[PDB]
Design a protein around this nucleic acid. Structure first.
Lengths: 166, 121, 52, 161, 116
RNA sequence: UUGACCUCAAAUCAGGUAGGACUACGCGCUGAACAAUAAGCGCAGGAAAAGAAAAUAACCAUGAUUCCCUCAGUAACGGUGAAGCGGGAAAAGCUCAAAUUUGAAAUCUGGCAACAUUUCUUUUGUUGUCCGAGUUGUAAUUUCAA
RNA sequence: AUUGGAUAUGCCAUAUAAAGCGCUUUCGAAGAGUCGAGUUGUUUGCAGCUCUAAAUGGGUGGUCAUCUAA
RNA sequence: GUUUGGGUAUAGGGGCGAAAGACUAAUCGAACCAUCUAGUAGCUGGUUC
RNA sequence: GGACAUGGGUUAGUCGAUCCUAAGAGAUAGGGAAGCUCCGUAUGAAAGGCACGAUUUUUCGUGCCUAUCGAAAGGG
RNA sequence: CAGAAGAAUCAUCGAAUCUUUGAACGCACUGCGCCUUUGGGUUCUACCAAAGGCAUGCCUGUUUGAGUGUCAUU
């Protein structure tokens, strides 16, 4: 498959091929709107490892945010507000320049039958997943709020627990 | 007064002429109230108002049952003919698609379902 | 007033068992039943045991 | 005292009273019919399981149990076969016999061949006898499905009975 | 903030009814699954034996139970634990074997198409 | 000339969907004066979040998460203040990306048409057919425990 | 009246199918502006900025153990 | 012996510096409201047969 | 009593409003902002019309031109 | 109180009705529009009324496009 090559090629972000493409695409994205719909992922390998399927009900939106919160976290929340009928699945860095970091957000339509009938993505239709990006439940949101397994990562201390037989 | 079952045993234009007659009678009775009426006329006002309501109810249900008949077995039906439970229930996954499974999980429950068993003491 | 007032009291399980043993023994003393206020003046015997 | 509670206190519409709470009422048994017929609704599930001859838990109990009456080296065991276990009570014996008769009824797991399977293995047999399942597998014309010798056996036994 | 405990007898009863509700459903089988015997991990508690999470893949294989049928008959599987000594292996293999001997497995209704 | 495709528009186009409220409990963000506090802002559900180890340990090892008790006012840090172990409650596990179906896109939305079904003429499907989506990858298969 | 999971039984069943176990003179892919480094904020975690990886590699503990992130 | 009605826009401290810029403020000077707050008491007044 | 109680009383094609614009405000295009929201008003917006024709391979060619709110004292 | 005589200021509740507003949705906040259909009248190219429609963002599909965007066409 060609996805292995795309994943190995995405590691050389400053090679002649990738640096040239970054220049042309960053210029292209700045000509467009701050948030624009993407007809297809620029990194199909990256999108699909994040949950993206080339089926009806999956939507890719491109957004640019200014550098200098996490820019990825800002990208998801602004795109989620822009398309308020969708569910923010995930997001990935696509490009950057001196002023802008560029991200593609993966969204899913919960009212589409192709999503409501797919057992691998039904969970996002359930109403507990309204605005996962607004509650920190995305991949970047979990990492930002310190959620993680290990030792690196209140109320039971501020409360006095008085039992009946004390 | 007007009985609902005999009202439902009539046709729509007959129900319309009865409604028009009752509206005239109500108008005359309210004219009698301003000119000075008796308790019988004032009591007849409420009965006429309920009789108008019953005729309007029968006309509306007959109209809506016709709409339900026209749209029976159609993919799309009028919003007022659709279910109204709650907004959230309407957005919920249906029992069918809430029970959709991958072939992978279908094979697992086909070949290794939870067994019935017991432990002897 | 606060709900976290102390309502329940701990008693050592041995002292509770002591008091229950003392309560049964007192129940077998006819004079304590009268002082308690029981009309047992015609009871055939204390402790009063009936068949099964 | 809430505005929403004062709202229906001064209302004329009756409260939506439901009568569902009766403590001490243990859940009635559905599921097994034999267990249901021998379950006494007053007793606890530990008392019911022990009376029926079943173990409520296969693990230690995390507390004292009730006393109502004054109670009167790898290889050898890794290879040993535990000789089942006795059925203490009548209900356990009833469950055991019910399981065995059910298993006996649902015991003929072997299927006959279909029209295509029969013709498939018959044509292979009529050329390579009935023992050279290796050669039948390697036969490319007759074994178009590329069945292996083990599957060509399973077809042959299924055709016999 | 003060946490009170006035719902302690209530919590006790609610958990009892949950066991009763569970037994109401799964009536003949036990309310708990069988847990393995493990040795606690420290020099202060390693002389004891407590209940583990599930039985290891090596324990199930020696006991003849496939990892797919183990969950069906109520035998938990711990894919993370391993047997570093044969004493842990023998302790829990015989625990499974005793459990199997005391087990009555009720047959299942199967589909059987008419043709081959 | 004719036609493919890409990108981008338009429609009171066919059908959907978002907002506001409640807000005890829950998750984010922001955050003072004297506290991961109050106030402010965002978003949920009947619970939420967390969750099947880039986890502990140094043992004869443990084994997702959560919660209770303990650890323990201990270690550490200089008054602040844990966690592993231990005891309990409840227990259930898993799905993808990365593989050529390649002897056959095996996948799916929608239109129309019948046929069923219903908490229900109100719900939910099935079968057929057609147009599309999709090879810039939809099914089946596999998830490291393999 | 409406439901739930079983039981018995009827009909239907696209099984030329699909699984578990057991064997190997054949294979076994594993997530990047991420980890990390430098530096600046908030309180080791996280955020910005500059720089920017690897493949028995990488993370975390104590040559070893343990784990397998994005 | 040019005011004014209605409608309107809007900069708003202080010194530093030639200017620009800063160095802290500000919502200007303030007012009112509600919360924080039961802020800070070596004190005043009172403290029950 | 301008109080209490009981009833009644305001009639428009031409009088005012309704319409227009004023200084200004303001949504939209876009761009910021962690964000409640802020900047922005023809701005690098595909910013909306009219006519012609024996019907044009019965699949439309040719030509032309290119928000709203704010005045019962202003305009009508 | 009067009056009425399957009653009821009854209960339950699965059918309906549900004015003007409000997230509030044609545009404004006494009003002013547009589109479709139907109807009336003692007057019918006029006037009137009625009913049903016309907010924004986004998704899927549909239709109609635009491009000195990438090409093919003996």
């Amino acid at each position: 498959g060609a996805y292995k090559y795309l994943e190995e090629l995405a590691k050389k972000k400053q090679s002649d091929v990738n640096l040239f493409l970054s220049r042309v695409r960053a210029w292209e994205y700045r000509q467009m709107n701050v948030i624009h719909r993407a007809s297809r992922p620029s990194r199909p390998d990256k999108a699909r490892r994040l949950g993206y399927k080339a089926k009806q009900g999956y939507v890719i939106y491109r957004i640019r945010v200014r550098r200098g919160r996490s820019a990825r976290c800002t990208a998801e929340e602004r795109v989620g507000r822009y398309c308020s009928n969708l569910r923010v699945l995930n997001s990935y860095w696509v490009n950057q320049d001196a002023t802008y970091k560029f991200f593609e957000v993966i969204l899913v339509d919960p009212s589409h039958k192709a999503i409501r009938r797919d057992p691998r993505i039904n969970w996002i239709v359930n109403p507990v997943h309204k605005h996962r990006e607004s509650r920190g439940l995305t991949s970047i949101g979990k990492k930002s709020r310190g959620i993680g397994k290990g030792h690196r990562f209140w109320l039971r201390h501020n409360t006095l627990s008085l039992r009946r037989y004390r | 007064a007007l009985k609902t079952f005999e009202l439902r045993k009539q046709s729509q234009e007959n129900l319309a002429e009865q409604l028009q007659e009752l509206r005239q009678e109500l108008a005359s009775l309210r004219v009698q109230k301003i000119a000075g009426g008796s308790g019988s006329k004032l009591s007849k006002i409420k009965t006429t108002r309920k009789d108008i309501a019953r005729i309007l109810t029968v006309i509306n249900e007959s109209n809506r049952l016709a709409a339900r008949e026209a749209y029976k077995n159609k993919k799309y039906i009028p919003l007022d003919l659709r279910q109204k439970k709650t907004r959230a229930i309407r957005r919920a996954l249906t029992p069918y698609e809430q029970s959709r499974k991958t072939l992978k999980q279908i094979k697992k429950e086909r070949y290794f379902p939870l067994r019935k068993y017991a432990l002897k003491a | 007033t606060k709900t976290w007032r102390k309502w329940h009291v701990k008693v050592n399980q041995n002292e509770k068992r002591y008091a229950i043993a003392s309560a049964v023994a007192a129940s077998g003393v006819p004079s304590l039943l009268l002082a308690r206020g029981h009309r047992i003046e015609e009871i055939p015997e204390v402790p009063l045991v009936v068949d099964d | 005292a809430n505005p929403r509670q004062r709202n229906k206190q001064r209302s004329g519409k009756p409260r939506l009273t439901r009568r569902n709470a009766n403590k001490k009422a243990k859940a009635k048994i559905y599921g097994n019919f034999v267990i249901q017929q021998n379950w006494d609704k007053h007793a606890t599930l530990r008392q019911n399981y022990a009376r029926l001859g079943l173990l409520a838990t296969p693990n230690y109990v995390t507390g004292g149990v009730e006393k109502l009456y004054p109670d009167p080296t790898l290889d050898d065991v890794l290879d040993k076969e535990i000789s089942i276990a006795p059925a203490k009570t009548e209900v356990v014996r009833q469950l055991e016999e019910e399981a065995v008769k059910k298993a006996a009824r649902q015991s003929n797991k072997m299927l006959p061949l279909s029209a295509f399977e029969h013709a498939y293995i018959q044509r292979l047999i009529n050329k390579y006898g009935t023992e050279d399942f290796e050669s039948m597998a390697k036969d490319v014309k007759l074994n178009s499905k590329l069945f292996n010798g083990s599957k060509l056996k399973n077809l042959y036994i299924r055709m016999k009975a | 903030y003060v946490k009170t405990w006035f719902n302690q007898p209530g919590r006790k009863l609610r958990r009892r009814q949950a066991r009763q509700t569970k037994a109401a459903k799964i009536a003949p089988r036990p309310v708990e699954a069988i847990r393995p015997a493990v040795k606690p991990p420290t020099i202060r508690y390693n002389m004891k034996v407590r209940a583990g999470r599930g039985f290891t893949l090596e324990e199930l294989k020696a006991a003849g139970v496939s990892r797919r049928v183990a969950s069906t008959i109520g035998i938990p599987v711990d894919h993370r634990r391993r047997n570093r000594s044969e004493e842990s292996l023998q302790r829990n293999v015989e625990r499974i074997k005793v459990y199997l001997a005391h087990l009555i497995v009720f047959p299942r209704k199967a589909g059987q198409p008419k043709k081959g």
